[PDB]
Design a binder for these strands. Sequence first.
RNA 1: GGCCGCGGCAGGUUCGAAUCCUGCCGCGAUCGCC
RNA 2: GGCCGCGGCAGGUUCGAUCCUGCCGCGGCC
RNA 3: GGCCGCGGCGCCGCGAUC
Lengths: 437, 437, 437, 437
Amino acid sequence: MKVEEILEKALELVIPDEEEVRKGREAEEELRRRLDELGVEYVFVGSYARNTWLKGSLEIDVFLLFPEEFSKEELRERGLEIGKAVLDSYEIRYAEHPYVHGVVKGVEVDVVPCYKLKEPKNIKSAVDRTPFHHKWLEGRIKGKENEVRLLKGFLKANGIYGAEYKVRGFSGYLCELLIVFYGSFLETVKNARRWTRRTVIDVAKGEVRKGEEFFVVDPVDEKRNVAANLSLDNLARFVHLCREFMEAPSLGFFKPKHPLEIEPERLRKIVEERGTAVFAVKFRKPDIVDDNLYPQLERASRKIFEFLERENFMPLRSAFKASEEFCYLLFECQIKEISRVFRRMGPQFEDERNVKKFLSRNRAFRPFIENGRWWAFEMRKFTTPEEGVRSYASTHWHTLGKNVGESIREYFEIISGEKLFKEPVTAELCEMMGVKD
Amino acid sequence: MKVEEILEKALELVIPDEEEVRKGREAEEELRRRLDELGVEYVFVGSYARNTWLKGSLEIDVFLLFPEEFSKEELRERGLEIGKAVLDSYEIRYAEHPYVHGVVKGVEVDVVPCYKLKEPKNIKSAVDRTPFHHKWLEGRIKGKENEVRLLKGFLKANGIYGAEYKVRGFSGYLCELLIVFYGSFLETVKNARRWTRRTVIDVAKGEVRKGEEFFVVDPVDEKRNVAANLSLDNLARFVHLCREFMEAPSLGFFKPKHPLEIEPERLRKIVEERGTAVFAVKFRKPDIVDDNLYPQLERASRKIFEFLERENFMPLRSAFKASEEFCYLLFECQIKEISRVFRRMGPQFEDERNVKKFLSRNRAFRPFIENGRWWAFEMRKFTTPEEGVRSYASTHWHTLGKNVGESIREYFEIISGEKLFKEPVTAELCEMMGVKD
Amino acid sequence: MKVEEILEKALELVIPDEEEVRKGREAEEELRRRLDELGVEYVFVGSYARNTWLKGSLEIDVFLLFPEEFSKEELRERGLEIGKAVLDSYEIRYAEHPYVHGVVKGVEVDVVPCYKLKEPKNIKSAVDRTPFHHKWLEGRIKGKENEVRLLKGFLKANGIYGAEYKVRGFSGYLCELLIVFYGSFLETVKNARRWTRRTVIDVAKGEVRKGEEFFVVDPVDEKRNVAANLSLDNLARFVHLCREFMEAPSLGFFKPKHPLEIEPERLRKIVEERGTAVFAVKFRKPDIVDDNLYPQLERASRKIFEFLERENFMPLRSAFKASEEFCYLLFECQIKEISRVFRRMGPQFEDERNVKKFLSRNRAFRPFIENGRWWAFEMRKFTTPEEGVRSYASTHWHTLGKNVGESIREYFEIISGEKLFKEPVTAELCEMMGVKD
Amino acid sequence: MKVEEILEKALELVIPDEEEVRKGREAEEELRRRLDELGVEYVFVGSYARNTWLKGSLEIDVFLLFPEEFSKEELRERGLEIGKAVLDSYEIRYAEHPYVHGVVKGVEVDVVPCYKLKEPKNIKSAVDRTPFHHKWLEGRIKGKENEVRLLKGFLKANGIYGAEYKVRGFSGYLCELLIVFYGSFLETVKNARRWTRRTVIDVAKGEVRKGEEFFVVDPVDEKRNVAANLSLDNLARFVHLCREFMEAPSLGFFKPKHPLEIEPERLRKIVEERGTAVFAVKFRKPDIVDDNLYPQLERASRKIFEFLERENFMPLRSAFKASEEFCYLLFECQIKEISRVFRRMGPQFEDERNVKKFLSRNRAFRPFIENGRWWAFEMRKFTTPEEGVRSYASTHWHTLGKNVGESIREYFEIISGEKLFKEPVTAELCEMMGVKD
RNA sequence: GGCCGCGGCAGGUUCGAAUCCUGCCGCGAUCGCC
RNA sequence: GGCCGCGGCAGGUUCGAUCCUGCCGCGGCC
RNA sequence: GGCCGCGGCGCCGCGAUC
């Protein structure tokens, strides 16, 4: 019902209120006062500094600017001292390098040390790019803050905001570049309908061209792809989302979807209708950050999926879920059970030695010749995908990711049938099988 | 035990007794009397003329020569007419060209018209080579007829004698060429152990060499392969047989093996242990010669096998049988049941026109994106190999051979489970599954 | 004396003599006989099959051609089986697939299994590319075999033939492509003088252009760089060698260089005069193949080099050496000894709290202010590069390569002075320091 | 069935048939005529001369009796000449002394030259004792030939007949002495039940004593033990077999046992259940006689076993097998994996010089004092028995037997897991793990 | 010839060997043994 | 006459072409 | 199997090379 009215109502869901702004302003003023006491060079960067952060996601980023002369150690020591002295309650977090996360008057704050550089050519670390990113945007994004907020809220409600591995979606910095390029949320959406997996957007040169992959050229560093970790599938989803929006605009595009929580009985009747084998590999979650866990959950799923393909259980899709205590690898297979007998390949009839060897082994049934080479009927170790995976996870745990694999070595179990519907994975199941609400 | 005594004992199971010879002599000289009255050019050829026919398989071949001053049409008229006016209880058989077949004083006889040719260059038809074959062998095979009979007996015992499509084995002409080449039965068996699927035996040039296929060069025409209809798997079986015989010689090799009759309950218990689906397509046998029938049964069997692979029922082997009234196509699949749901591939996400068309269809489940393409869960019309073949044979009867397919069109039934073991196909089922005695 | 006369004398050094060719032919014949006996499809490939192999380096490569339907497991099983059967004193090696290395009539052979492909697009495997490399070259290289041999000998004599990691030079395939491109060894050398680190040679297209890296396009796959593992410095050395050859042609360019082998006393005096700290980290060689060992020796020596840079010992160069039992990482530093006392950075003067903490630590000497920042004199844990490396190798063994690092972790020792000159590293030290003959 | 009838039945499996006697008798009488014409001093001895040879194991032993004047290599080459001019198809053989082996009219013959001695005082080698052994037995054994053959067959059916190193059991001569001592086969078995590892059987003195070891005094030489190469464990096995036989007599004791047939999968499941490390050392078999090979395989096994004990992998049992081309050294260990860290013992605390040296070695962790003594943590060079054996076999190949060790030096593999069950060692693995079915 | 058991000499391992393992020699045994 | 192989034509299948079908001549096989 | 580069926050994952 009228795009302009929808976008107007969508701002309410995204723009922070007076209270949250005032909460940030008071923390900012206190933060600067404490920093100025220490005589350190610093700069406020990121979403807060440009006023492009979402309602409910207030977080202040302060970058400490140190001379190029400093060592990495000196960069760390000094930085860790400034951070502790300036925050009410601090915590040492780790990324490319250590830094300090904490709180100032109720507001979350990151204090990150980096080098003060003259040109982007000296950029070695990623934290060294962040100040240049801010410098490039601070003037170009003015007046277009709410457009950024619309784009972010849009992506967030559809589960593709954030470039972290859990999402493999759009980074905040990517959104702001898109707004600078197209000028508004609506124009971004309109043009995105024609994006391909070979689209190259170059804000600095002000042009769109064709490349080898979907590439958003960092105006600060032409060799960097800002959308590097945006998956092909999430790109496709954004493009299709944009087509749907212009076709029939709705405020519902900006509203987070409520997961499908159906009764285990309806779920049982669905699986019965589909006639598939549905089961899960449950194991204890490794104590590691999301950015290590989720690529490993992806790897473990893929390996078991490929195994299921090789063993002729014909997997349809896989999925996974991480809770606080347990992880789950979910699978659906077209084959509930396969015959015990299978065909074992032998040598060609010409090979006297190896045929003799092949026929020497005792078997329940007689080998045979087909198309000039020997074959033998032999017996499978397992005849259901559940037991197949039980065997694979037992013996090939080392291939299911470093930490995920090691955990599966210590403990795992196969859960199938209606017992699986008791586990907290019904939402992932319904999504996996494409269940309509 | 030893070879020398084995072959001596084998000659008894191989050489026609004086009673069988006398039966043939009295039919020959009488048949010549009728060819002299009419005063027509004739010649006795084949296994009878060369005295190399195997015991029990007495059959006289008489070719009617006619001048080159005749068209392809004129030959059959005065050909068959001389045939009918010479044979007592005659009929008409169809293989290549029309010819007469009838019994004269006990034994059956075949009268084939053909041209009288000077050199083997004016050879248009295949029956034009038969005189030259006989003329090439009649001198060279003298003194080696028992060696020929041993090889024929050895082959007929193990179901690979005869080049007709029912057998796809060794022709009688091929057998005699091999004996002339190797000098004896024992030397043929000894050397054949080293035959490969690319061995070339050039009889006239007295050399073996490597080629593109198993090729026995016809002395009369170097471009012809005497072993053309000898299948690859029957070659393999002969090589393997020859190896086993030299290793542990026995008269049993010259005696046909037991029919192997298994009771329906042990057969049921076997199928259970294998865990496979076993079923048959039953239809009424077309009234055609075996050389037309068996290639069509092979085709129908293959087409259904390929359908089963394509539909992911994972067939193991197939076979077929033809009784007097019915034909059977036998199959064994590793999949008894597949899921109702399956994946249908859609267009890539950039392709808006086709994505819209792909998503417009109503389905029970939500389509999804994967690796840049759309995919849809859809439903199979059948979930068992039996039900799949019911559908296939019903709508694709036409491609199951000209006559076999037409019969299947008029009537067929799928027979599975215990009810199949009542059908007269137990021998073929046991062979197919490699059931050992 | 003339360029062409030298090339004529050089042919004697690179062309295989009659005896070696005969040794190859007879091995080939016996190998073909063994393979044909087994019925397998195969193809001779590589330098031997194309007659471009270098004098004294006779080696036969045979690829077993399997159908695409074979699984990897079947491919590997049938491959190894055939390899073990046709080769004497065989040996199982491990590349992409395990393959069989062995001997046939005194000649070394590789039997490698691969897929028989129709189009090069089905290639995701390096061994699958080899048959296509052969088909592309077998015709185009005819009449140019001696030119390839000239180029290989030129490269080998100067230690840059072979793309394996020990060499990081030119592969045989690359050499042959270059000869096809330029037509001769002389033209290749003449044009190579103008090569740069951005040169792109497109062989199939017969053009040269500029790119991001030195890139020789594989005619079978335009995405592949045939010179991928040619190091930058070895490219540089070849270009320089080419300029030198054309300037003053000599047969010496084709002759291997003999090691220096100077007396330990002379080497000692050279190091004394240079006034440098020269030492080695000695540890046991891991039982791994060259292609894993050498990249790890490169990493380890590089990591220790960087440590020495950080610790202000001012390294000049590093080198390494692998013997059968031991490995050596060699270093030369401009600093033999650094002062005990050093400068420790403190906080800026404004920071009252951290200054206090900084000044509260007990020290032998008083802290001081310089450029608005507090500093303190503190003591180094080590004062020689030998002891620094001793510490670093002890505590950071994990960064010196997985296998090399694990070895050093178990045992290493720092050798220097007269003890070092007794170790078998004289050649490497001389080269490292640029000692003239 | 009574014992008497079982023994009556057993004779059938044990006495050579009339054709075998006529074969040997004709070969004998013919072998004499050739020896008499030359006018050479000869004597028939051994199991044939006394008619005690077991069914199927016919061998004619002829000894050439030469004067004492011809020393060593004088009669060695002369007797060898006589051996050729009497045998049909001969061949030379070694084993502690030289001789000639061949055939005479299908029967196998040995021709061993030796000294003609007055009394058993002039004894030099074992070849000089044989005629005296024969002389001592030829009269006493008369009428008890079948008792000897029962004992021989009994032992052979249980793999403990023969003194050769592959067996380490009862020699034929020992068997005869035992029958002469106890009178019959049945009395030997009854009394053997009470044999201990200190039983001394003195035939010449007709008594049993208690001594230091199992000792059967040779009636020809009181100093030598006829049961010298009978192992303690085969003595044990025989005594246990005799107890079993008298408790529940059976003809089965005279029939050899078929090896245990077992699926690789069951074997994998077994090793999983046991939780042990099971692996083999595979290498090419040296071309040497059994009497040299097997003692070397025993030595190699023992050495590696002792290495495994020392390195705390806690081996259970070992075994070995020789195939046609390869040997296998099998091991089962209770430790699949051991920690990298271990304790190294240092000097006593008061020993200042040695403490200083011990502590001078740089190490990852701090040394410590325990019970008046210094200790340090250090790192193993391997953490699995597989890694350990690979290292040990590489460095200490020389000690693993003369020929066996040299072969290992050239090449060996370590095979474990499921790959090992493909090797022809399943019977041995079943035996050493005590697998029953 | 190979293996087995003792005596002698030379190495390796070690902070340090009469002893812990490798090698070269002498004397017996087994197939001292075979 | 059937089967197999090789070419051209017209339809099914699919979101749309890879894949199944039918029709005509060429070569092999019984 | 190891090495190099990319990605996300030194640890993981993915590409290139042998």
